[model samples]
Structure formats: C-alpha cells, structure tokens
Target: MNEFTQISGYVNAFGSQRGSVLTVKVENDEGWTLVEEDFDRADYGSDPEFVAEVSSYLKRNGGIKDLTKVLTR
Candidate 1:
C-alpha cells in the first residue's frame, strides 16, 4: 500500500504539472531506497502512459529491476 500510495501521490503531482521535474526512488520493504533517479517532464520521451505504466509496474511484487525497468523503458 505504501508503494502505491507514493506512486499515486506522485502521479497526482505529475498531473498537476504538465512538466514537473522530480526525484523518485525505489522503495524496499525496509523503508530504504534501492535506486534513485531524477524524473523530468520530458523523460517519458513521448509516451503519455507513465501514470498507467508506472503504477502498474510498481504494484507488482518485484524489486529494483522492475522499478528501474518501468521508468527507464
């Protein structure tokens, strides 16, 4: 719930701003960030599916791999 909570919050902010540059990190069960990266508005390249793509990727029981893959892909 925590992970989704944060993602939900971030997506909300993403919607609030047409191009908001922010930082997002992978959350582990221990409340530690596994990977960190800066998220720019143009980071999506041209896809308008980040909120959908990312949240779904985040919801699955996964790890840094999924976290990194979702954003990087």
Candidate 2:
C-alpha cells in the first residue's frame, strides 16, 4: 500500500496578495499530516549559482521538477 494520502489545494496570502497553494497530506492511520506550502514561480533565468541553489532546494524538499504541471492544473 502507498504510505501517502491525498493532495489538496487552497489559497493563502503572499506579500499582501492572495495566491494558490497545494499541499501533500500524509496518512498514518491516526490522522492526516500536512506538508507545508511551497510557493514558487517558474521564471528563474539562467543564473548558475541561483539555479544550483533552487535545484538543491527541490531535491531536499521533494519539490516538483516541472512547476507547469501545478500551474496548469
């Protein structure tokens, strides 16, 4: 069995603006645990060091490779 539960969406405040958010909920048969919101944009240009940091952040936090999927959906 997959040890994960459903993913869901919501809206939250971002820099005095409201933005969409998605969260992955984990199930442990006791209750649902939430993964915190990871709000990001897909417009980072080719800055080597910044790009490397973003990539590392994704790998560390289990973030998506293609943010388009989230944005489109």
Candidate 3:
C-alpha cells in the first residue's frame, strides 16, 4: 500500500453510483483537475458543467477550507 494526504470530501454513505452502494468520493489534483480517483477507474469527464458541479460539491464539504493549499505526498 501507499500513503497520501487526500483532498477529502463529504461522505455520503448512501447509494447511486450507478444506482447502488459504494464509498463514493470526489477529488481533484494539484493541477486543479477533477477526477474519480477511486472506484474502478481513474476516469474523468472534466466537463464544463461537471466541473461546476464538483466545484460546488467540494465547497459544500471540504475537509480543509482551502484545498488548493492541501499539499501532496
């Protein structure tokens, strides 16, 4: 395994990642790019509206107020 200081988000221990249950989370790199870092693939849409959605999401529930300053490992 490895270690990292994750850019944590609000935990919604519910359903609906394809309409089921999973510990879903959203994360962005230092490059200011949003990605599905977990789950099966590290795939990302990086879409305009989707970016807006993620931006709104993180702001609503960020572990650190300023994730930009959250350093990497």
Indicate which candidate wins on lDDT.
1
- Steric clash pairs (candidate 1): none
Q: What shift in Å separates residue 36 of candidate 1 from its native position after superposition?
A: 1.2
lDDT of 2 by residue, 5-38 (tens): 2322122111111232222222222332212333
Per-residue alpha-carbon lDDT of candidate 1 for residues 1-73, written as tens digits (9 for 90 to 100): 1132244432221112223544444455455544444445565754466544444443332333322333322
Model 3: which ten-residue window has the lowest total lDDT?
Answer: 13-22
> Which stretches in model 3 have alpha-carbon errors above 4 Å?
1-46, 63-73
lDDT to native, each model:
0.40, 0.30, 0.34
Clash pairs of candidate 2? none
| Poorest stretch of ten by lDDT in candidate 2 | 9-18
Model 1 lDDT-worst window of ten: 9-18
**TM-score of each model, paired residue for residue:** 0.39, 0.25, 0.26
- Give candidates' CA RMSD values in order: 8.8, 12.8, 11.5
Number of the candidate with higher TM-score, 1 or 2: 1
The better candidate by lDDT, 1 or 2, is 1
Q: Which candidate gets the maximum TM-score versus the true structure?
A: 1
Q: Give a tens-digit lDDT track for model 3, residues 1-73.
A: 2223333333221112342112234333443423232232223454454444444544444322343434322
Ranking by lDDT: 1, 3, 2
